[PDB]
Structures are given as C-alpha cells and as structure tokens.
Amino acid sequence: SGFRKMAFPSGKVEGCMVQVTCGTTTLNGLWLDDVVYCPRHVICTSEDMLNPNYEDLLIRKSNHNFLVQAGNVQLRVIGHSMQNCVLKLKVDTANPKTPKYKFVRIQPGQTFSVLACYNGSPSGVYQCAMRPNFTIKGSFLNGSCGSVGFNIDYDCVSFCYMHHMELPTGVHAGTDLEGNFYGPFVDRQTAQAAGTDTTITVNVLAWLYAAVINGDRWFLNRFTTTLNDFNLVAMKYNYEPLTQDHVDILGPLSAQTGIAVLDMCASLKELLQNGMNGRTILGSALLEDEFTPFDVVRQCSGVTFQ
C-alpha cells in the first residue's frame, strides 16, 4: 500500500549523459551509439539569442568547436548536423552503455520521468506530466538544458523530451528527441507565454481509484451521473472533457474497486462543487491530475523493468 509520485529507475539514462561545450555555453547531451544529441541553442551566444539564424550560425562552426565530455573522457566530434531544434554531433566512439531505446512523442496528459542534469552529471530524478498547454511543471536551473524525459518499458527506454527553456511563469518547454517543440514555443528570446491550461480529468479519476485502492473512501457516494451531465460540470471547473475512451481506459480500475466509472464521476462532481471540507485524499488537499491510469495500475500492482 501507499501511493507516491514515482519515477523510473534512471540508471539506463545516466549512462547516456554527456557534457557539451561550445564557446561560452555548456549544456547536456544524450549519447546514443555514436551520436550526441543536444539543444541547438548551444551554438548561440548572449547577443545571438535575441533572434538567431541557426543555419547561418551552424555553417560557421567547426567540429573542433564542439567539446564533448563523457565523464573524464573527451569524445572527438567527427561531424555535426542540425535536425529541427536539436543538434546531432557524430563522435568517433559509440556509447558502450547505449540501452535499447526509441524516440517517441507523447500526448498532453501523459507522464514521464526527468533526469535533471548539469555539466553532463545527473542531479536528480522526478516525475512530470505534459500539460494540456504543452508545458511541463519541471525543476530546472541554468545549465539543465539537454536533460531528457523518458519512460521505460521492460528494458527499452522511450525518450520523449529534451529540455530547452523556461517560460515567464516558471514552467518549462522543450522538444521531442527529433527536435520538434511541444506546443507553440521557439528557441529564441521572444515574449512567449504558456497559454491557458486545464485539469487532466481522466488522471484525476485514476487517482481517485488509487485512493480507493489505498483505503480513502470518504468521497464516495450512492449518486451517479451521465457522461454528458458530468462534462457540463467539467467545463465549468476548467477540466478537460471526459470521453468514452477515457471511460474504457478506466475499466480495469473500475472492475478492481467495484466502483462504476460514472459513479466516480459523480464523486468528482461533488468534490468540485463542495471542495474537500478540510479533508485529504492520498495526502493531498487538491485533486491531483499527474497520474495516468497506467501509473496507478503500475504502482498499485507492482510492475518492474529489466
């Protein structure tokens, strides 16, 4: 029993982290086979960053301008190229610690683990969700760019995020590992802003099931609601619509607890209209929306990874 915000074990990713230095800029790179991936704004300097032309900037660079450190071992860069907002540095050594991996792009509402890194050295690991507005509520300081987000499926690491920047509200934006940003953000200095967010309804329901599985039942009731009537309430409280596919995804958790999905919707409705009355759910006084149904099943059942 118990329910924690849980990340994947980070060892497979730690072995891929390197330090990339170009000019005055040092950030992190991801070393897989004989390529190091990193944010392309590494080729920028403090007056380049206002409105740079990266193609112009890159043709001016040399392989030897890129300093790559794998711990205390220097990797010779033998080629470079740009792919969207990432740089691909070809090195003369394949990473002997390369795990089985995939480059995947995730959906808003899905979760992943972040290995925060500085100077190519892992600092910490934590769990994030991709918000509906394509930002993530991370924890990142100067020098964290190139840190990556990932999921692990048995022995395969699915990389889904590389960190690029902080927005003015303190949330974070970045790209998939093909260099394509999540959301309408650019790797430049403009007045970029997040844009309105919503609460991930299916995740809140999954967490309520996590609570029931763990013995928190005070919010349960005998009432039910229809999907349409629930979604009218969701609209009003800035929750995203619940679809029939969400209902279907919640089926297993429904069956394990014996609480019909629409019955849990009725409970959520009352929580939204009444609040919590000084009470808590799984140690929170807010409705938590950064656990997916998968996250709940994995934790409340015990899936491992080799």
Ligand X SMILES: *[C@H](O)[C@H](C[C@@H]1CCNC1=O)NC(=O)[C@@H]1CC2(CCC2)CN1C(=O)OCc1ccccc1
Burial letters for 46-65: b for 16+ Cβ neighbours within 10 Å, e otherwise?
A: eebeeebebeebeeeeeeee
Among the listed residues 22, 38, 41, 44, the single catalytic one is 41
Residue among 179 and 267 whose Cβ is closer to ligand X: 179
Does residue 162 touch ligand X according to CB under 6 A?
Answer: no
Which residues contribute to the site for a copy of itself (CB under 8 A)? 1-12, 14-15, 71, 115-119, 121-126, 128, 137-144, 166, 170-172, 214-215, 280, 283-286, 298-306
Partner touching 84 among a copy of itself, ligand X, none, CB below 5 to 8 Å by kind: none
Q: Which of 297, 216, 291, 302 is nearest to 5 (CA)?
A: 291
Residues 10 and 113 sit within 8 Å (Cβ to Cβ)? yes
Partner touching 292 among ligand X, a copy of itself, none, CB below 5 to 8 Å by kind: none
Binding ligand X (rule: CB under 6 A), the pick from 189, 238, 243, 280 is 189
Task: Round to whole Å and give the CA distance between 92 and 68.
Answer: 11
Instruction: Please say if 163 is a catalytic residue.
Output: no
Q: Return the range that interacts with ligand X (CB under 6 A); candidates 136-144, 208-216, 244-252, 290-298.
A: 136-144
Distance between the two ends of the chain, CA-based, in angstroms? 23
Helices 261-274 and 201-213 cross at an angle (nearest 10°) of 100
Task: Round to whole Å and give the CA distance between 236 and 240.
Answer: 10
Residues 37-76 contacting ligand X, CB under 6 A: 41, 44, 49
Binding ligand X (rule: CB under 6 A), the pick from 140, 150, 161, 239 is 140
- Number of Cβ within 10 Å of residue 71's Cβ equals 10
Among the listed residues 38, 128, 145, 160, the single catalytic one is 145
- Number of Cβ within 10 Å of residue 284's Cβ equals 12
Does residue 27 touch ligand X according to CB under 6 A?
Answer: yes
The kind and range of the H/E element at 251 are helix 251-257
Instruction: Please say if 145 is a catalytic residue.
Output: yes
The kind and range of the H/E element at 295 are helix 293-299
Residues 50 and 188 sit within 8 Å (Cβ to Cβ)? yes
Does residue 261 touch ligand X according to CB under 6 A?
Answer: no
- For residue 216, the minimal CB distance to a copy of itself (Å) is 10
Residue among 184 and 275 whose Cβ is closer to a copy of itself: 275
Partner touching 189 among a copy of itself, ligand X, none, CB below 5 to 8 Å by kind: ligand X
User: Which residues sit at the interface with ligand X, rule CB under 6 A?
Assistant: 27, 41, 44, 49, 140-145, 165-166, 172, 187-189
Could you list the active site residues? 41, 145
